[PDB]
Design an enzyme around this catalytic site. Sequence first.
Site, PDB file in Angstrom:
ATOM      1  N   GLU A 176       0.794  -0.997   0.207  1.00  0.00           N
ATOM      2  CA  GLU A 176      -0.246   0.074   0.064  1.00  0.00           C
ATOM      3  C   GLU A 176       1.009   1.278  -0.116  1.00  0.00           C
ATOM      4  O   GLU A 176       1.760   1.235   0.506  1.00  0.00           O
ATOM      5  CB  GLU A 176      -0.905  -0.012   1.144  1.00  0.00           C
ATOM      6  CG  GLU A 176      -1.674   1.365   1.597  1.00  0.00           C
ATOM      7  CD  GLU A 176      -2.442   1.233   2.907  1.00  0.00           C
ATOM      8  OE1 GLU A 176      -1.899   0.599   3.996  1.00  0.00           O
ATOM      9  OE2 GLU A 176      -3.653   1.375   2.945  1.00  0.00           O
ATOM     10  N   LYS A 203      -9.376   2.505  -1.982  1.00  0.00           N
ATOM     11  CA  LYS A 203      -9.776   1.633  -0.787  1.00  0.00           C
ATOM     12  C   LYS A 203     -10.833   2.137  -0.382  1.00  0.00           C
ATOM     13  O   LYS A 203     -11.237   3.244  -0.071  1.00  0.00           O
ATOM     14  CB  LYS A 203      -8.397   2.100   0.321  1.00  0.00           C
ATOM     15  CG  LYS A 203      -8.605   1.299   1.588  1.00  0.00           C
ATOM     16  CD  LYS A 203      -7.321   1.764   2.580  1.00  0.00           C
ATOM     17  CE  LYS A 203      -7.116   0.879   3.671  1.00  0.00           C
ATOM     18  NZ  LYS A 203      -5.941   1.376   4.437  1.00  0.00           N
ATOM     19  N   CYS A 211      -5.125  -3.213   2.492  1.00  0.00           N
ATOM     20  CA  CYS A 211      -4.886  -3.081   3.629  1.00  0.00           C
ATOM     21  C   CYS A 211      -5.957  -3.376   4.516  1.00  0.00           C
ATOM     22  O   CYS A 211      -6.360  -4.563   4.371  1.00  0.00           O
ATOM     23  CB  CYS A 211      -3.956  -1.929   4.087  1.00  0.00           C
ATOM     24  SG  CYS A 211      -3.239  -1.854   5.774  1.00  0.00           S
ATOM     25  N   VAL A 259      -0.272  -2.530  10.729  1.00  0.00           N
ATOM     26  CA  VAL A 259       0.223  -2.092  11.759  1.00  0.00           C
ATOM     27  C   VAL A 259      -0.273  -3.063  13.161  1.00  0.00           C
ATOM     28  O   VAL A 259       0.241  -3.113  14.047  1.00  0.00           O
ATOM     29  CB  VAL A 259       0.183  -0.758  12.292  1.00  0.00           C
ATOM     30  CG1 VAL A 259       0.700   0.345  11.190  1.00  0.00           C
ATOM     31  CG2 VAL A 259      -1.513  -0.299  12.250  1.00  0.00           C
ATOM     32  N   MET A 260      -1.510  -3.418  12.706  1.00  0.00           N
ATOM     33  CA  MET A 260      -2.050  -4.659  14.052  1.00  0.00           C
ATOM     34  C   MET A 260      -1.338  -5.879  13.635  1.00  0.00           C
ATOM     35  O   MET A 260      -0.643  -6.165  12.714  1.00  0.00           O
ATOM     36  CB  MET A 260      -3.574  -4.703  13.701  1.00  0.00           C
ATOM     37  CG  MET A 260      -4.352  -3.315  14.087  1.00  0.00           C
ATOM     38  SD  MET A 260      -5.993  -3.407  14.230  1.00  0.00           S
ATOM     39  CE  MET A 260      -6.635  -3.510  12.517  1.00  0.00           C
TER      40      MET A 260
END
Lengths: 262, 262
Positions: free
Chosen positions: B42, B113, B146, B173-174
């Site tokens: 991304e 997105k 994402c 990020v998670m």
Amino acid sequence: MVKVGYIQMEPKILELDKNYSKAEKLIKEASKEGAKLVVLPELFDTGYNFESREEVFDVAQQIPEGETTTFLMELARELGLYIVAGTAEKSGNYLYNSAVVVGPRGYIGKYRKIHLFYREKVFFEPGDLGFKVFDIGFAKVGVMICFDWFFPESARTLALKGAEIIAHPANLVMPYAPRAMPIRALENRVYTITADRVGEERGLKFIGKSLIASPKAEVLSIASETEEEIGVVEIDLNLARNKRLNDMNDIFKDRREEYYFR
Amino acid sequence: MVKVGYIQMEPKILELDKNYSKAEKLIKEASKEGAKLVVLPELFDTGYNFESREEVFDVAQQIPEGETTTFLMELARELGLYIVAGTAEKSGNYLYNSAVVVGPRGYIGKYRKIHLFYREKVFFEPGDLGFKVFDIGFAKVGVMICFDWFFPESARTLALKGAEIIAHPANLVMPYAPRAMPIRALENRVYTITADRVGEERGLKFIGKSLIASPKAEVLSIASETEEEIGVVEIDLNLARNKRLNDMNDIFKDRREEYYFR
């Protein structure tokens, strides 16, 4: 917080009374540990691997006046807890692979398996009540059975209707569900309670691995592959009611249905 | 059989040329391994953690006339392959968090997105073209970006529209996606290619773990947490076209949408 649990047991095919005795022993143990909601496996009363429609038809009980629902109503009434359990449902000339919900005040409702798996199609009619959510006072519980886990839409539908806990009676034979349940819990931010059976039954081998997953994909309790046991854990209903993954993303408010399935 | 892969890289925020050079180096490596479809992360060109909308607006390129799309078109023509890549899209006065699809003959199309994540809502407009499937000749490729992975409806919609491979540029990020992707692949019986970035950017740590999953939830390739690298695997698209799970269950024919929530 409230304690909930799965009952991982081994049904003996066609031996209703023995299966009720075993369920009672384990549910009483869970009650002593403080569980306020317990989940039994799919078809815990009749067993699963039927050789003909006639052998299951001959033992299947009607809901809610048949023996299975009546027996569970007694445990819920006398122990003071709620129970979701898989049971073979007889309805006139038809059979459904069902789950009953009972509580301290009596029968609450039932669910009929929407997505039948393999040979179940030979015996059972496909479910026709939709995905329902039931009020158990301290929480709203959605119910789905076994293979329903495979379709993300099953848990999704229950969660969107307000389910905070998805009670999931199962008789698992494929290896995937234990890896998928934490994702089902996470994507809907709900708690899931998969109560699987164990044992070998006429050639089929169930995998056990009953498990409770949190809205954060945490496996709070997971059972053995082959032993009968209970799993009782404290859950936080506010972690399931608040759909805010972070301060800028509420998972349900973020859904954009106009772009789904089309 | 066909070879497909991910490109895991570390975009340097706002340094477009440097990021094109890095993407070119890794895509050439993937091409040498035989890859015919490659996926970049991304926002591979601009980086991710912007301090203000102005910062990203001032470098964002237009699609398909801007530098990112023309650079990728040149590269795909030179190498004879297909590329799916995440890129910041300038469209008039607006910005979208998008992905472009290019091939040996030129521009194929774009995806914007649909489910914006966290601060992205401060800079980008929500996607508005729906979940699209692109034909690249030897395969039908769906694209999501994402956080779209969090909503099961994203991958489901792509698969219902015929996607055999879901190309998935990401900046994770998670910790969850690597555990969820094999389930998204399994439940839709498709191959998934998650191309994640790596690195720390203005205090935000990305997790790496780019991965390719099969229709049977097999992790065919999984990358490191912090290094730039590629992953190319051979896949059999017939395993995505056949939705049979067993002799009595076909996943898509078994869906009963009338009972699903809307």
